[PDB]
Amino acid sequence: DCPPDWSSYEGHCYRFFKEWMHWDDAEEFCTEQQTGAHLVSFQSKEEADFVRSLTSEMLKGDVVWIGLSDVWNKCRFEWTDGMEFDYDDYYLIAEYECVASKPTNNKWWIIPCTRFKNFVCEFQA
């Protein structure tokens, strides 16, 4: 059973934090609440909609941090001229952006991870 201030759903526990930190602080903050916790992850749309009801006391047009980070440096690149290159030489080539959700329309925003957002944590045991 989910701790106080946590709403259950298909086995897990969630919680909307009105804290204002960056993706990293966000992710780490979650892990330091209940073992196994992380930023929220949306498997199906139903899950999303369920996390949406928890994020209602928030403004219209804002976004909450979700469990996805550094989405550009995980990519595989290539040049038009087909030039060769060793990925080790491309350590921080792209921006360090993470994903934020807009509960209203559940649209994911890929923004810089240095931005302060409200967030949602999750865990099941």
Binding site: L39, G67, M83
Partner: protein, 133 residues
């Protein structure tokens, strides 16, 4: 030698174009300006960067922030994180297609030598590259 306009570096011809276009459009335009030409390609930390860096700094003018280069995210999904922070696989997604940044451009600061991925649909000037004709 290099065709009038195109500058030469280590046996190749580079050229700056003010004409702001999107990523693919600037690429096509390069593979139509010479045989075997595309958006410039940079050896991450080679003196070639300084060349193209200065290459643009001199030619580009006023206040343009970016200049496209021939490097993009090959991935076709809208983002490249295949797992959530909890280890769970990334299947379901909703990425807002306009925040999708797969196209690399040089940045003005430090004299166009700092890379950055931008929205490919953006209209920016550029640099073309191609071997000797």
């Amino acid at each position: 030698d290099c065709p009038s306009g195109w500058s030469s570096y280590e046996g190749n011809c580079y050229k700056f174009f003010q004409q702001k276009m999107n990523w693919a459009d600037a690429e096509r335009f390069c593979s139509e300006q010479a045989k075997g030409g595309h958006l410039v390609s940079i050896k991450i930390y080679s003196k070639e960067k300084d060349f193209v860096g200065d290459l643009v700094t001199k030619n580009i003018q006023s206040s343009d922030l970016y200049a496209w280069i021939g490097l993009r995210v090959e991935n076709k999904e809208k983002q490249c994180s295949s797992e959530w922070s909890d280890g769970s696989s990334v299947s379901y997604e909703n990425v807002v297609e306009r925040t999708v940044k797969k196209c690399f451009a040089l940045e003005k600061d430090l004299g166009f030598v700092l890379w950055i991925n931008l929205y490919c649909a953006q209209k920016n000037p550029f640099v073309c590259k191609s071997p000797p004709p």
